[PDB]
Amino acid sequence: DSIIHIGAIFDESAKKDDEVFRTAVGDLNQNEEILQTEKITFSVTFVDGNNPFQAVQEACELMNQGILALVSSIGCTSAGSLQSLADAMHIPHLFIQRSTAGTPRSGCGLTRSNRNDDYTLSVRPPVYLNEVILRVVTEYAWQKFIIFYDSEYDIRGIQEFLDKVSQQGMDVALQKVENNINKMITTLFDTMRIEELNRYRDTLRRAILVMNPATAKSFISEVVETNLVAFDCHWIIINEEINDVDVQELVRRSIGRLTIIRQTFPVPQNISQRCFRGNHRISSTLCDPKDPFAQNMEISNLYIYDTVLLLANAFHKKLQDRKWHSMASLSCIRKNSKPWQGGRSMLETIKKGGVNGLTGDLEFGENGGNPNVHFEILGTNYGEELGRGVRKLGCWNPVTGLNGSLVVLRVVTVLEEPFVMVSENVLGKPKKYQGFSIDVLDALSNYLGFNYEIYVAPDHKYGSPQEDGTWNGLVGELVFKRADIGISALT
Amino acid sequence: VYLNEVILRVVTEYAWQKFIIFYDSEYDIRGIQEFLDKVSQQGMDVALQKVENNINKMITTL
Amino acid sequence: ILGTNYGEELGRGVRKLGCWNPVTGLNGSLVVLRVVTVLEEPFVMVSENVLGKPKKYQGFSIDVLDALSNYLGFNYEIYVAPDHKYGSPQEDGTWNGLVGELVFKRADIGISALT
Amino acid sequence: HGSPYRDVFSQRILELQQSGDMDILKHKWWP
Numbered sequence: 001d002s003i004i005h006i007g008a009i010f011d012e013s014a015k016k017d018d019e020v021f022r023t024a025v026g027d028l029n030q031n032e033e034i035l036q037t038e039k040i041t042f043s044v045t046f047v048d049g050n051n052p053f054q055a056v057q058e059a060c061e062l063m064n065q066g067i068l069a070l071v072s073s074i075g076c077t078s079a080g081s082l083q084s085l086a087d088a089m090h091i092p093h094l095f096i097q098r099s100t101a102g103t104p105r106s107g108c109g110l111t112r113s114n115r116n117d118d119y120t121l122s123v124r125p126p127v128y129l130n131e132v133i134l135r136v137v138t139e140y141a142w143q144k145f146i147i148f149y150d151s152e153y154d155i156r157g158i159q160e161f162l163d164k165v166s167q168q169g170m171d172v173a174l175q176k177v178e179n180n181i182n183k184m185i186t187t188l189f190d191t192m193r194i195e196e197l198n199r200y201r202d203t204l205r206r207a208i209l210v211m212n213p214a215t216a217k218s219f220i221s222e223v224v225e226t227n228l229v230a231f232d233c234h235w236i237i238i239n240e241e242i243n244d245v246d247v248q249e250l251v252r253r254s255i256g257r258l259t260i261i262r263q264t265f266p267v268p269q270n271i272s273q274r275c276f277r278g279n280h281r282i283s284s285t286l287c288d289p290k291d292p293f294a295q296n297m298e299i300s301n302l303y304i305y306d307t308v309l310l311l312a313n314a315f316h317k318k319l320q321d322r323k324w325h326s327m328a329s330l331s332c333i334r335k336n337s338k339p340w341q342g343g344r345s346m347l348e349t350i351k352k353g354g355v356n357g358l359t360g361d362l363e364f365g366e367n368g369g370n371p372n373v374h375f376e377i378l379g380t381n382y383g384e385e386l387g388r389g390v391r392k393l394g395c396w397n398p399v400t401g402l403n404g405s406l407v408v409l410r411v412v413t414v415l416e417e418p419f420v421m422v423s424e425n426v427l428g429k430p431k432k433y434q435g436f437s438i439d440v441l442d443a444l445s446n447y448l449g450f451n452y453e454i455y456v457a458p459d460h461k462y463g464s465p466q467e468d469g470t471w472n473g474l475v476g477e478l479v480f481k482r483a484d485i486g487i488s489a490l491t
Numbered sequence: 492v493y494l495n496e497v498i499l500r501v502v503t504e505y506a507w508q509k510f511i512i513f514y515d516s517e518y519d520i521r522g523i524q525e526f527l528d529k530v531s532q533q534g535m536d537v538a539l540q541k542v543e544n545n546i547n548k549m550i551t552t553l
Numbered sequence: 554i555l556g557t558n559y560g561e562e563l564g565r566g567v568r569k570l571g572c573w574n575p576v577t578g579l580n581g582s583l584v585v586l587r588v589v590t591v592l593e594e595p596f597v598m599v600s601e602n603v604l605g606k607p608k609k610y611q612g613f614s615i616d617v618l619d620a621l622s623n624y625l626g627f628n629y630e631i632y633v634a635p636d637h638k639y640g641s642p643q644e645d646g647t648w649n650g651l652v653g654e655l656v657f658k659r660a661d662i663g664i665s666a667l668t
Numbered sequence: 669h670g671s672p673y674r675d676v677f678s679q680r681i682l683e684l685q686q687s688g689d690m691d692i693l694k695h696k697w698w699p
Contacts, residue, residue, distance in 0.1 A: 154521075155520060155521065155524070156519075156520065156521075159520065159541065162539055163539075163540060163541055166538055166539065166540055171536075173531055174527055174528075174531065175528060175531060176524060176528060196534075199534070409673075418697045418698075435697070436693055436694075436697050439693050439696075440680075440681070440684065440690075440693075443680065443684060443689065444677060444680055447680065448673070448676055448680075450673075478669070479669065481669075484671075484673075485671070485673065485677075493575055496575070497573050500573065500578070500579050501554065501583065504579070504582075504583045505583065604687075604688075604689065604692070605688050605689060605691055605692030605695075606687060606688030606689070606691070633686075633688065635682075635685050635686035636685075
């Protein structure tokens with residue numbers, strides 16, 4: 001007999017969310033510490049996520065079967081209808097927002113009626129794309145740039161960023177990138193000229209891509225191939241979801257500088273503690289980063305696992321505190337439709353729950369939303385020695401903000417006023433030099449951000465050049481490479 | 492909704508090249524996305540700004 | 554499409570300028586200069602120095618530029634010529650002083666006492 | 669002989685002369 005039954009409504013594109021949901025229920029039903037005597041059962045329905053009536057109808061059928069909570073992984077189109085249904089029926093609604101086609105998330109902006117109690121808990125963190133991008137452009141001292149966005153991006157997600165750049169007097173262009181890039185660029189060459197083209201190439205020297213990884217890879221290749229960008233270009237790509245395969249392919253197709261900003265998950269480092277959270281064992285396929293499935297997981301998939309883990313802990317606490325309310329068969333749109341009487345107490349128990357999972361820590365603030373998020377910032381580099389590649393520049397989170405900003409020279413000198421002048425002798429040899437030459441050196445040291453040590457030349461003279469091209473003094477120190485740089489009045 | 496088409500025709504007739512678009516707190520800016528693409532293609536200097544429902548604070552702060 | 558008008562005779566008001574529909578369309582008709590200068594009072598005089606370089610310029614040439622600026626309605630920015638030279642024939646190669654900055658195009662206009 | 673800091677030094681020497689930060693120094697040791 002099962003008294004623990006949960007419902008799930010998935011978009012048709014969310015097959016991986018269903019696979020992970022079922023695996024998470026499997027993993028918990030093998031955990032003897034949580035729900036010691038009770039197995040979790042479930043009913044899952046797939047719906048067209050652009051049909052809100054179908055989403056309501058199928059969610060209502062799950063409520064007729066009898067559920068303790070409803071998990072959804074779906075876009076904004078049907079989100080408002082499910083949230084309002086959950087509020088009417090008192091069913092705790094664990095909402096995992098899916099983006100369309102890997103486009104950057106924007107807030108749903110459903111503006112759900114606030115007269116009634118909110119039964120929806122938003123599992124994914126707030127959209128912080130606008131805050132993160134503003135911090136990164138500010139660090140790079142950008143003043144003029146173009147924002148390219150995909151065909152599915154909701155530009156209300158950058159409205160605050162646009163207001164802020166306008167307040168600071170920046171020249172910010174917007175452009176939608178059509179799903180077919182070649183036509184957009186081919187049309188551009190046919191219609192434009194050399195002057196206009198030089199102006200467009202100048203505009204493309206600094207750009208932000210607010211788009212899915214597949215469109216960004218195509219868009220970068222097409223502009224590189226047509227020579228609309230060059231080695232001096234600097235593009236920023238921002239999206240919560242860009243996998244390691246996508247990052248490498250973006251770096252590979254790009255010339256110049258590329259900055260990639262994506263969501264990261266603060267999970268344990270040690271191999272043993274990777275697939276465990278306390279005594280809860282996670283299936284290897286989701287927690288081992290060498291597994292092919294784990295590397296190909298969507299961000300929504302990680303949140304779905306942690307949602308099931310959170311619900312089980314909540315149900316466990318409700319059963320271990322003698323406050324259980326049995327599930328009820330509910331009916332929608334009937335004369336005597338009535339909410340679940342156990343719903344208010346279940347919602348409050350889930351809301352103050354917290355679990356360590358695949359996303360890091362999943363919990364809810366007072367507003368019913370998960371507050372926890374971390375972004376990492378990757379960047380390209382180049383030398384002849386290293387070739388092309390990418391490394392981690394920094395991290396961002398909404399609490400501590402930006403962390404991580406985005407050699408000692410051997411100096412030979414010769415004393416000869418007033419270029420080099422001894423300001424402090426300690427033990428009869430200089431520690432502090434002052435002078436015309438030295439002040440230029442202290443403008444160099446501070447500005448390029450190098451450290452130095454200064455020692456005199458072996459005779460405080462440039463010397464005489466010895467036979468066969470041999471040098472001594474300060475000059476010999478440069479030739480024998482025994483001093484990095486020479487700060488003096490050297491002729 | 493033909494707002495984007497009408498506004499483009501009127502700005503063109505007046506030979507505008509630089510201007511600001513002020514919109515309210517309830518306006519969906521997807522309604523002018525096509526207008527924004529067209530002015531950008533013609534090389535115009537077009538600023539956007541949302542006007543907050545409380546104007547005095549926005550201007551006083553300014 | 555409505556529009557305002559004004560004269561002393563009519564005062565303020567509004568009238569219909571035109572119409573638009575998606576079939577027939579519209580019916581009824583409806584720079585920053587770079588200044589290179591050379592510092593030499595009292596033509597260009599430093600009125601305020603900040604970190605050993607002028608920040609605000611005063612003198613006869615600057616007032617003449619404020620009269621020129623209002624008429625054409627251009628705005629400007631002034632930076633000091635780094636060489637402190639006005640420029641005169643260079644047989645050694647490149648033009649020095651004010652003249653070289655314009656020849657090589659690093660300023661659009663040059664405001665100095667250049668003979 | 670060969671250095672990757674040469675480029676930024678030559679740039680900074682121009683930049684100090686142009687800013688007039690270099691001109692303050694001359695007055696300093698040479699009034």
